From a paper:
Our approach is applied to discover inhibitors of 8-oxoguanine DNA glycosylase (OGG1), an enzyme that is part of the DNA damage response pathway. OGG1 recognizes the presence of the oxidized nucleobase 7,8-dihydro-8-oxoguanine (8-oxoG) in DNA and initiates repair by excision of the damaged base. Recent studies demonstrate that inhibition of OGG1 is a promising strategy for the development of drugs against cancer and inflammation.
As commercial chemical space lacked elaborations of our most potent inhibitor, further optimization was driven by reaction-based enumeration of virtual libraries using commercial building blocks. Reagents compatible with Chan-Lam, Suzuki, Ullmann, or amide couplings were identified and reacted in silico to afford molecules with similar topologies as compound 7. As the docking was performed to the active site conformation of OGG1 observed in the complex with inhibitor 7, several compounds were designed to extend into the additional subpocket identified in this structure. In total, 16 compounds (8-23) were successfully synthesized in-house and detailed synthetic procedures are provided in the Supplementary Information. Twelve compounds showed comparable or better potencies than compound 7. As the docking algorithm did not take protein flexibility into account, access to multiple structures of OGG1 representing different active site conformations was crucial for successful fragment elaboration.
Numbering used by the authors: 10 to 284, 287 to 324
Write the structure that this text describes.
Amino acid sequence: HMRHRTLSSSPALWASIPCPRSELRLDLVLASGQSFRWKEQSPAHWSGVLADQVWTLTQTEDQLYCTVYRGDDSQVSRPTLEELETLHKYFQLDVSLAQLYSHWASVDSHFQRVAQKFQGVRLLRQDPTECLFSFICSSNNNIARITGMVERLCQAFGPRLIQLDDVTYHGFPNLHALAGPEAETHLRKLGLGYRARYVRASAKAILEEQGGPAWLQQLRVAPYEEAHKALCTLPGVGAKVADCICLMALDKPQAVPVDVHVWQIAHRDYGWHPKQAKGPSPLANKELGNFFRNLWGPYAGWAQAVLFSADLR
Ligand SMILES: Cc1cc(C)n(-c2cc(F)c(CC(=O)Nc3noc4c3CCCC4)c(F)c2)n1
Ligand code: NI
């Protein structure tokens, strides 16, 4: 009945945001292991769900074009003022990335070289709940299999929003939906495996032990160090996942997620070694995060995103 919009198809349902392609490149952000809810359904046209609404995004060299599917028996219209603000905040466009790129480049020659080809790699501001459970699914996994688990989870537990072509879009489920007695059994049938236990247990933990998703909003305004320790109390959430949520959902730009893949890059590209544990360890991982914060400063997580994205391509 309804299909994915292109900029050529129905231009009268698109609104623009004055966004240089140096400030944001959709193709290096939306599928670069931050969000797992965006797909290039048509060429240079990215479709995904944001807060119970579906968006399609495309860009020129100077403009970011966006169209909304409000997903109901409502008159089709262009993005509103409030809806465009939501997208402005989601891409954190108030913060200059050009000024950050130059600042990082001044103290790191390796970044200066990589940065040239890979511009507009910025850090998305995600919903804490979506980010939390997305990154519990990320353990010993790849972007493709993570994307599948998150989609299947959302269809199974989340409310239906709209259908565009063959793709049916579901909003991310609330904690109560994931905390139910059959939840783990269902998630195992959807292929999450062991991660199904942590999803249910963490949903149950936030509700019962922390008092619902207002807790995650408290961690947003809490110091990085307090937020990180609070998150590490949840089943399946360790230092790596806690840092991911801190950087991508709780407004901690200094948070640097460290796993074996970040170790590889740090060693190979920066010559970094732990100043006892020859290989990775909780203490050595903590030291590596500090090393990058000392080097790049209070937006070290955003600098890591540039390298991480550049490494995927
Ligand atoms: C063996 C293999 C192959 C692939 C494609 N992966 C893979 C890739 C991923 F992107 C992710 C997700 C992720 O961890 N993203 C991130 N971690 O720190 C950061 C990011 C994003 C930008 C800020 C810093 C994953 F869990 C696995 N692993
Ligand atoms: Ni070495």
